[PDB]
Each structure stands twice: as structure tokens, then as C-alpha cells.
Symmetry: D2
Subunit: 180 residues, 4 copies
């Protein structure tokens, strides 16, 4: 965890006036978000211009900036929901990993196989599949079209509570409590 | 909600790199918090030095500034928990209200009556009581010693989702969606 | 809220053994879920065989039964996510309503108009759109192909907390605190 | 994690009618809870009738049974908050552990030391202290009176999401994903 000192007391543990609490707690409203697939597809195909790019790092996140706290730019698609899209070229692999964040996958394009906890399934467009919290899961695109997926995850909720664990690549030595 | 416009597009609706998302979603760890009762009671007595202050506003938030997100000083006592303390003098009342946020009460000191949806209970030190989401509740402090309450609630969670409602004072025409 | 008595005290307010909390707090793990679009679409068609069906009631919930608490059937697609699909025939409307639950809409097929808080967008397939909590929103399907939507929402989370509100149809008198008996 | 088979398809993956869904998500309302400290203390003191009782297991949970899904006996104090109380005799210890659930401690009675990630703090009645998610923490009661603490936590939130981790005793080999099965 951390090397810290309480020998100067606890300056961070404070007591504030209800007006400051209330002023910080109430949020602006968020305008509706709209995103177009062409732009998502443009974004992701742009990722291939980077030499340092591979299949495991080829996600964009779909965000509504109004959703942020205070005046800050948010990263949720709504306040409590998070969403990303991913491109996998045929023949690419996303190797086994796990995280206690769950993921919800919707196949927009492409075919392939998904492996979770030793079992393979062969996917096709508009399949829906989940990778349960802390389940080992891996991808391989097949066929002649890129796999593009629309993904809902709660990684961010757990990050904010500081309860996110990730293990990539596979192997106990790779487990991390996900904090800066 | 809002008068708004899409006539110029949805500039707030965006698509971002996985590295930006990751960087904004991982949080700093949080040093343990410690608060002293004396400081809480002192904070509360201070408020009385406001002439324009009454029983319904006599609350302080207990915060651990580390639990903030990104650069924000936090207002939770932990990331996902929120705590307040409140002081009612004998013969004061917090009149009927409701909010969709729940509240959990620990009576540290004092006695009196809690009314929730038409039923009255007489509390004493170290009683524990809940005011269910959206239930009409009211307080009347009795005896000679001030009522001091230690309060756990989820008001901030609903506030962040923009899903929080507040009816004060009693009367459906007083309901507000709590944003702005 | 409710008429209730405490005259008999608080029998439901208990104190339980650590063993009992733990036996009840720890869940079974959950097998991964897999749904095929064809099962969804078939499901949505069946609903038209009902004469007492219209645009507004025409949704199915995609569920993972393993996700239940204790030994019960779950209602989530994951423990904390909720997923629905809806079908609107062209020329149908979903009338203006609001709820403090949020909705994330993916257009799989169809075209039409989304109205949110007085602003209209014309959607096409694979567009993504949100209806923020408690915003007035309305649907009208256009063109020739049915609109089919993949929808994620937090309604169940708010319901479990008993902090969910729903106003349908539009009008403050239609507001309900969504608990068994409204 | 899981020895499972998809060789017989995925029968748990269902599609249900809105009517069945709505019928299942909407819950009964919850009566207010009230609990009295005398009864809590009596509970905790009772537990010491068990001879194989120690400081690590001297907790009871404070529950509002109306809070459960369906007509089920729930275990939250509210739907989304969970509350326990614990008794530590002076000279007893809760040894180092960590869990990704947070804990919020209110000292009702007693005195002692709280250690979190190498730092000690000496506690007294009506002190408020947190043990952040995944921080090593340990207790030792001092003085001539039992430590009684009023504790709020989100262990159950995490348990339900199947995202709860627990390491007791200290040491990585003892980390568990907390699901029925894995310790
Ligand atoms: Fe993954
Ligand atoms: Fe209140
Ligand atoms: Fe709606
Ligand atoms: Fe602990």
C-alpha cells in the first residue's frame, strides 16, 4: 500500500460547513450525448497509425464530458456508466487476463472466439457476451473483417472507490491494486 | 431539466484515447482518516455564532480530503461513504421533509422524538435509527442536554448520478431535482 | 410513503451473528453469459402476437440468471449492469416521459427521431445516444425498417435502493416513488 | 476460479418479458429501523458463551430485514449501507489484514491502538477512524474497559458484485476472491 506518517497529525481529515459540503455535492445537469459509429470507427482506425499499437491497447472510450464533477471534463458516458469500443484485426490475440471490473460485450462487426475460464465460444455480429468479475478471458479475431465491439464496464466505479484489481498478463505476480 | 441546443452539434460528446481514459480513471490512494469528537462538537458550537442559523442547518460534514477524485479535495469520509454530524437544542425541531437519499442516525448525546411517516419514537443516547429513502421524517429534541447525532447518508451518491430528489418543506410542490 | 405501526415495536430491526451475515453476504460465482441477436429479435416479435401490446411495452430484458442473490434467479446481465432491447415499428411513438434512472441507447437497426428536453436528433444505425436522468425523452421510428435498440440502464439499481422515480406519461401528477404499491 | 462447460449451451442466459422484469425489480418499501445499544451490547457479550470465541469473530451485524430483495430477510441496515458492531477485550488483538472493502470506525467505548500501514494511533471514545480499501490494519484494546465500535462498511456491496478481495492473515498467498467456493 503506502509509506505515510501521522506524526504531524491528520491535516487531510477535516470538518467543513454544510454550505461548503452542499456547494461541492450538487452537480450541473448533463446535456444528452450522441455519438456516431463512423467517428468511433475513424478514431479506432487512427490508432493503427501508431507503430507502438497492438490489439490489447486498441480501445477508445466514449465519453460525455458534461458528466464530470464540478467544471471538470467527465469520462463516463453517463455519470455511473462507462463505455469503450475496441478493434481487433483478424489473427490478433488479446491474451488471458483478469480484473474485478466486469465487462459487457456487443459484437458490432467481425467474428472470432472468446475464451473465459477454459471455455471457447465462436462469436458473430450482434452476439452479446459477459466476462464476469475476475474471470480469465481472451480474444482472437478470425475471418476477413476486423472485430469491432461496443463494451460496457464498471472499471471506473471500482477505480473511484479504490477497489479495482487487475492482472495482466496472467500470473499472480501481475495482480495490482489499481491506484496511482 | 433544461433549455439546450444541438444546433451546433454535440462537442461535449467525445471519443478519447485509451491512455487519456486510463490516466483520468486511476486515483491516488487515500491516507487513513481520524477525527476527534471534541473537534466535531466544537465545529457545531461555532455555527451557533451565526444569528441567522437554526436547527435545520446545524450540520458539519466529516471529510477525508484524500478521497477526492482527480484534483478535487474529497467530501466523503471514504470514497463511497458520507458522514455528517448534527446538533439540535432541546425544544428545537427539524420539520417534516423527505429526500430519496437515506440517512442512518447514531445518537451520541441527547433525547427526543423522531417522527417517520406518522409514527413517533423517543430516542435516547446510542439508539440507532434509519430514515428510509423518501420517507417523511422529523426531529424534536427533548430534555436538557443537546442532541448530538452521528449521521451516515448517501446523499452525495445520488447527487453525482444527478438522481437525487429533495422535498423541503413537506408538500409535493416543493420537490426538486437536485442539480445546478 | 406508507401507513405503518411501531406500536408492536421493531421486530424487523435485528442483530445477527457474524456467521449468519457471512453465509448470506457471500455469493456464488457467475458463469459468463451469451445471448444471440436472433433470440432477442424472436423474443421481440412474439410480443406482437399479443393484441394488448404497443410501442411502449415492447422490450425484453437480457438476463444472466446466475447473477441472482442467494439461490435465486438474477435479473441483471451482470450483478451491477442491466440490459434491455426494444423494438419500435416505423410510425410508432414512445410518448414523452422521464425517470431518474439513466438510459444508454445503441441503434442496431432503424431510423427515427429522439426528442430530449425539446431538442430533436435524427438517428440511424449504430448511433449511440443517452437520455440523462429525469430528462424528458421521446421516440418516433421512421423509414421502412423497424428500430431495434440495445439499451443499458441503471433502473434496477435505483429500484433496489428504493430511490427510483418514474413520471409516465408526462405530468407531475404521474410521478411515482417506484415501490410495490405505486 | 471456475471449472465450467458451455458444451450444453448457455441455459442461464435468458431473455425475459418486460412484465416479468418489472415485476422482479420493483421492491417493497422498508419500514424505518430502530436499534438500542443495550441490545447490541447484550448480543456481543453473549458471543463469549462460545469458548472458541476470540476478538476476530466478536462481531454482530445490525440489520433492517425489510431491506432485502423480494420478501427476503435482508442484511443491510439500509438497502445500500451495512453496519456491524464489535467488542475487543483489553489485551486482545485483531492482527494485520486487508480487504478491498472500506471500514468506518466509531469508538463507542474503550481505548487502544489502531495500526494502518505502519502508523499507530491511540484511540478513545467517540473517535472516528477509517481503514482505506486494501490498507493493512490491526487493533489492540488497552485500558480497563472493553472496546465497543460501531462500524460502517461496503463489504456487502463488493460481495454482491463478486469484486471483494480479502487477505487474512497477512501475506499475498492468503488473498481470496470472496465467492462461495474460494475461501
Ligand atoms: Fe478484459
Ligand atoms: Fe432528512
Ligand atoms: Fe425512458
Ligand atoms: Fe478489517
Amino acid at each position: 500500500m503506502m509509506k505515510w506518517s501521522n506524526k504531524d497529525g491528520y491535516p487531510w481529515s477535516k470538518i467543513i460547513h454544510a454550505e461548503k459540503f452542499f456547494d461541492k455535492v450538487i452537480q450541473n445537469d448533463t446535456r444528452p450525448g450522441k455519438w456516431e459509429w463512423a467517428d468511433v470507427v475513424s478514431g479506432l482506425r487512427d490508432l493503427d497509425k501508431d507503430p507502438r499499437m497492438n490489439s490489447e491497447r486498441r480501445y477508445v472510450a466514449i465519453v460525455n464530458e458534461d458528466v464530470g464533477l464540478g467544471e471538470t471534463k467527465g469520462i463516463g458516458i453517463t455519470p455511473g456508466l462507462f463505455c469503450g469500443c475496441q478493434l481487433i484485426h483478424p489473427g490478433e490475440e488479446v491474451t488471458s487476463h483478469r480484473h474485478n471490473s466486469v465487462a459487457l460485450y456487443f459484437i458490432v462487426e467481425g467474428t472470432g472466439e472468446l475464451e473465459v475460464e477454459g471455455e471457447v465460444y465462436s462469436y458473430k455480429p450482434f452476439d452479446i457476451m459477459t466476462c464476469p468479475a475476475w474471470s480469465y478471458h481472451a480474444w482472437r479475431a478470425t475471418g476477413d473483417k476486423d472485430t469491432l465491439m461496443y463494451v460496457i464496464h464498471d472499471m471506473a466505479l471500482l477505480a473511484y472507490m479504490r477497489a479495482l484489481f487487475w492482472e495482466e498478463p496472467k500470473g499472480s505476480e501481475n495482480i495490482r491494486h489499481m491506484v496511482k
